[PDB]
Design an enzyme around this catalytic site. Structure first.
Site, PDB file in Angstrom:
ATOM      1  N   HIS A  41       0.826  -1.239   0.000  1.00  0.00           N
ATOM      2  CA  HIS A  41       0.000   0.000   0.000  1.00  0.00           C
ATOM      3  C   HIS A  41       0.851   1.277   0.000  1.00  0.00           C
ATOM      4  O   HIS A  41       0.262   2.348  -0.163  1.00  0.00           O
ATOM      5  CB  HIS A  41      -1.005  -0.032   1.146  1.00  0.00           C
ATOM      6  CG  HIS A  41      -0.441   0.170   2.506  1.00  0.00           C
ATOM      7  ND1 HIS A  41      -0.255  -0.894   3.371  1.00  0.00           N
ATOM      8  CD2 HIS A  41      -0.158   1.285   3.212  1.00  0.00           C
ATOM      9  CE1 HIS A  41       0.177  -0.425   4.543  1.00  0.00           C
ATOM     10  NE2 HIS A  41       0.271   0.911   4.447  1.00  0.00           N
ATOM     11  N   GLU A  72       0.913  -8.401   0.556  1.00  0.00           N
ATOM     12  CA  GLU A  72       1.172  -7.025   1.107  1.00  0.00           C
ATOM     13  C   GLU A  72       2.662  -6.719   1.192  1.00  0.00           C
ATOM     14  O   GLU A  72       2.964  -5.726   1.854  1.00  0.00           O
ATOM     15  CB  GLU A  72       0.437  -6.808   2.427  1.00  0.00           C
ATOM     16  CG  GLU A  72       0.206  -5.354   2.812  1.00  0.00           C
ATOM     17  CD  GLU A  72      -0.482  -4.470   1.800  1.00  0.00           C
ATOM     18  OE1 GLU A  72      -1.156  -4.975   0.872  1.00  0.00           O
ATOM     19  OE2 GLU A  72      -0.208  -3.254   1.856  1.00  0.00           O
ATOM     20  N   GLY A 146       1.610   5.514  11.088  1.00  0.00           N
ATOM     21  CA  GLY A 146       3.049   5.806  11.158  1.00  0.00           C
ATOM     22  C   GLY A 146       3.924   4.583  11.439  1.00  0.00           C
ATOM     23  O   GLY A 146       5.140   4.743  11.280  1.00  0.00           O
ATOM     24  N   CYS A 148       3.663   1.568   9.817  1.00  0.00           N
ATOM     25  CA  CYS A 148       3.707   0.632   8.665  1.00  0.00           C
ATOM     26  C   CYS A 148       5.135   0.527   8.125  1.00  0.00           C
ATOM     27  O   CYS A 148       5.863   1.535   8.037  1.00  0.00           O
ATOM     28  CB  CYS A 148       2.705   0.969   7.574  1.00  0.00           C
ATOM     29  SG  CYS A 148       0.987   0.620   8.093  1.00  0.00           S
TER      30      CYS A 148
END
Length: 182
Positions: A41, A72, A146, A148
């Site tokens: 993402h 992911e 914040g 990730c």
């Protein structure tokens, strides 16, 4: 403060950079040579900022399992003039559960951040932001925006990168040795 925090610090001090895309600032783990990982993402493009320096992306691959399900993890090869320490020997070979993990983050918003998250479950399937996702690890810590890309470690193993949370639980994508064979 103890041996879990020691391993985590040793990884942060040599094998992380701050990555910036159009979607934010992320902790980015360097794995070997000029290869690093970041949550998918982050939407990595042809150019990324690495410690606030414009860097060409030589390759980016958004990993999916053999059922064509999102994992992911995006593997990025950076046009950088320096190699990462090779940490592939710290990556697990299989999906597993863990005790006593640390989540470590380094950004402008959260420098030098370490969180003891406790027990990590092989959760498996997660609907992450509406996207079916596999190979998810879960810890019962109230993670926040914040974090990730934060690195999840135990003593002697680098097991995942933080990709999301539900307010009470945090979720990481597994890292497996097989993602980085060359």
């Amino acid at each position: 403060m103890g041996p879990g925090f020691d391993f985590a610090q040793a990884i942060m001090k040599k094998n992380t950079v701050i990555a910036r895309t159009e979607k934010g600032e992320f902790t980015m783990l360097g794995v070997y040579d000029r290869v690093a990982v970041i949550p998918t993402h982050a939407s990595v493009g042809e150019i990324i900022y690495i410690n606030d320096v414009e860097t060409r992306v030589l390759d980016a691959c958004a990993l999916r399992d053999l059922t064509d399900t999102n994992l992911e993890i995006t593997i990025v090869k950076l046009d950088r003039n320096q190699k990462f320490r090779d940490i592939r020997h710290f990556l697990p070979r299989c999906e597993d559960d863990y005790n006593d993990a640390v989540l470590s983050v380094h950004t402008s918003k959260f420098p030098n951040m370490y969180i003891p998250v406790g027990q990590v479950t092989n959760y498996g399937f997660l609907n992450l932001g509406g996207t079916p996702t596999h190979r998810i690890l879960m810890y019962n810590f109230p993670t926040r925006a914040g974090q990730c890309g934060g690195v999840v470690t135990t003593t002697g193993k680098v097991i995942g990168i933080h990709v999301g949370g539900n307010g009470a639980q945090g979720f990481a994508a597994m890292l497996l040795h097989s993602y980085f064979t060359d």
